[PDB]
Amino acid sequence: QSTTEEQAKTFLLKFDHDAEDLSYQSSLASWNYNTNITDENVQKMNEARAKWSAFYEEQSKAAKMFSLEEIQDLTLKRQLQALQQSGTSALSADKSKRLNTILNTMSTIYSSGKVLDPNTQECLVLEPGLDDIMENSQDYSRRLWAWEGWRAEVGKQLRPLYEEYVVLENEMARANNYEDYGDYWRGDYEVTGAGDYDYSRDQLITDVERTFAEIKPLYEQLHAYVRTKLMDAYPSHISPTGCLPAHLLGDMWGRFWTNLYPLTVPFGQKPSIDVTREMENQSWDTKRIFKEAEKFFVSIGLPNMTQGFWDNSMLTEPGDGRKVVCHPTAWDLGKGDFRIKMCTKVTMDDFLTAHHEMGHIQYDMAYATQPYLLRNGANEGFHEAVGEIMSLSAATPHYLKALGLLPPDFYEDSETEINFLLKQALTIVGTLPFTYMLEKWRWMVFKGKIPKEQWMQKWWEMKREIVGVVEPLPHDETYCDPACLFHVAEDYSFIRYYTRTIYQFQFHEALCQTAKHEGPLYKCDISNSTDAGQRLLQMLNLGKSEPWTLALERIVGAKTMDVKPLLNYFEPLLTWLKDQNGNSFVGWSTDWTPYSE
Ligand SMILES: [Zn+2]
Numbered sequence: 001q002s003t004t005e006e007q008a009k010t011f012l013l014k015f016d017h018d019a020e021d022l023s024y025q026s027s028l029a030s031w032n033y034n035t036n037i038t039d040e041n042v043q044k045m046n047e048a049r050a051k052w053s054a055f056y057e058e059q060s061k062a063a064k065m066f067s068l069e070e071i072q073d074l075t076l077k078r079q080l081q082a083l084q085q086s087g088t089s090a091l092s093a094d095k096s097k098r099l100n101t102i103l104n105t106m107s108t109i110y111s112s113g114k115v116l117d118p119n120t121q122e123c124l125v126l127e128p129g130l131d132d133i134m135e136n137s138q139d140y141s142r143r144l145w146a147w148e149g150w151r152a153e154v155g156k157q158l159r160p161l162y163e164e165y166v167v168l169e170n171e172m173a174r175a176n177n178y179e180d181y182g183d184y185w186r187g188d189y190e191v192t193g194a195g196d197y198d199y200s201r202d203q204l205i206t207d208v209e210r211t212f213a214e215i216k217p218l219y220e221q222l223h224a225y226v227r228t229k230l231m232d233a234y235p236s237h238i239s240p241t242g243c244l245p246a247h248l249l250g251d252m253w254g255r256f257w258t259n260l261y262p263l264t265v266p267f268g269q270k271p272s273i274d275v276t277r278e279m280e281n282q283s284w285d286t287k288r289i290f291k292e293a294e295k296f297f298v299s300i301g302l303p304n305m306t307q308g309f310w311d312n313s314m315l316t317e318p319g320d321g322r323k324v325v326c327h328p329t330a331w332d333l334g335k336g337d338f339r340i341k342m343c344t345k346v347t348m349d350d351f352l353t354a355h356h357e358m359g360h361i362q363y364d365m366a367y368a369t370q371p372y373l374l375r376n377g378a379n380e381g382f383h384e385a386v387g388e389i390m391s392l393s394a395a396t397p398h399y400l401k402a403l404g405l406l407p408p409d410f411y412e413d414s415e416t417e418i419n420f421l422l423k424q425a426l427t428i429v430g431t432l433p434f435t436y437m438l439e440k441w442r443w444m445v446f447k448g449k450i451p452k453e454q455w456m457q458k459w460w461e462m463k464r465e466i467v468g469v470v471e472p473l474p475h476d477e478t479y480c481d482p483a484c485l486f487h488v489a490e491d492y493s494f495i496r497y498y499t500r501t502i503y504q505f506q507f508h509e510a511l512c513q514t515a516k517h518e519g520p521l522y523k524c525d526i527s528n529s530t531d532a533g534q535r536l537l538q539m540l541n542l543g544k545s546e547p548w549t550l551a552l553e554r555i556v557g558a559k560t561m562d563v564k565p566l567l568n569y570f571e572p573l574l575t576w577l578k579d580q581n582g583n584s585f586v587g588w589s590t591d592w593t594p595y596s597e
Contacts, residue, residue, distance in 0.1 A: 090175035147247035155479030241589035300533030360387025367543025381499030509565035
């Protein structure tokens, strides 16, 4: 009968056999570059990546004559659907070539961003001279001049390419039978043929906006409290009900505000939890962290890293003159070979990133038994949310008390707990309204709601009423604020962070419900509960074999976005905050603006 599937299976077997070795020596070569950057190394990475991309493109062509309706299995259909994608080659040669030469332009000059100090004696760049200026500062004029000087230069040259890039991305989107660029990016959450365990492309936009509404009371309370704290910082340019200027947004993008800790501390006489001296008095090294971490994983059934970790992977930067990338990285080389790199140190932040790197790799070991094309997470957010929830339990006071990092008689005060809330909110949660509304801006930009002639001026126009941030000096159409971020030029999605955050909170709530912990969610501990690990394994094993819809239900019990765990987690803060607005106005007053009047 010779069903097409019986030859597509042989084709997929050949593809797996070739691609396993291809990526394995590519990843082996990839490791040799991160740990050793030379002239020879970059060349062979370029050759290997070019060969891999060419082979993938040939296999994408070879997937074309075998249709998708000839496979009834959903899991097998997913592999062909992933492989069938070609890319930008669908249009004519000239448009594709202009795409490649435009992408080259945003690679070279874009990375050479420069600012000019008013005084010539000091010259600073974005890394790290400027970053100190925006983030680590306690004055107004330095931030103002940095904002003006940086934004004055980069917009003019970089604005015109964005519209051409957008229209060309739309043209490739239409080439692949998609309605627009939004539908091109909204296809990552579409499930068809599964049944009731499905998700709609437009349902994500509607549900996220609905979840934003429940955030608004707590967001207003917190923003009012932080504003009342902030009037002591800039009395002469900010009204007690006015918006924060764009040059007092914490940093370049408003994403990281961590360095502003000394100014906005509620209780400055209560010290934060910092036991850094204690492990230095107990001779704890980075290696010892990895085995005490295992003690938590064995409680949930997760084993340790393979033997190749102990010898091949280095726990610190080499000192033989070779310069490396010190960012902690997660590597899945394949073929049972796994290597792990970071310039870790004995610090609490590195203490958490060590468990992230250990635990986020553990996801790879969970689905390592899946086929090579199914050796991935459920989606973009699941993989990056599994790692973060691991360190949540490692930072609990009980875990440190039982691990020797805390005294046996140590008692934590509720005022001490107050710092931990503000810290992790300021790190992860505080940007959730910002991230959601920025992606709303992009979606209406993608949907065409924002007219083409006001693409950048409505970013500032709705900023007055909706974003509640006032600009210090209006700029004309030539300027491009998104050009200040390196990720924009490289086409990096921003909904991944929001999905990761929501999935991480859902995972934490599900694990705590399984752990049968009682009380507010922040006191939850899942250590030593062997029954809680079997439930986790039920979700870890599936990997990419099942959709996120059903994978989320396997651990949580529901197949919908939920912010009730978030409200429960912040319940004490709400109960302590609702009375605060008695003597303060709620929201940001749009009547008073610093720029016009
Ligand atoms: Zn990770």
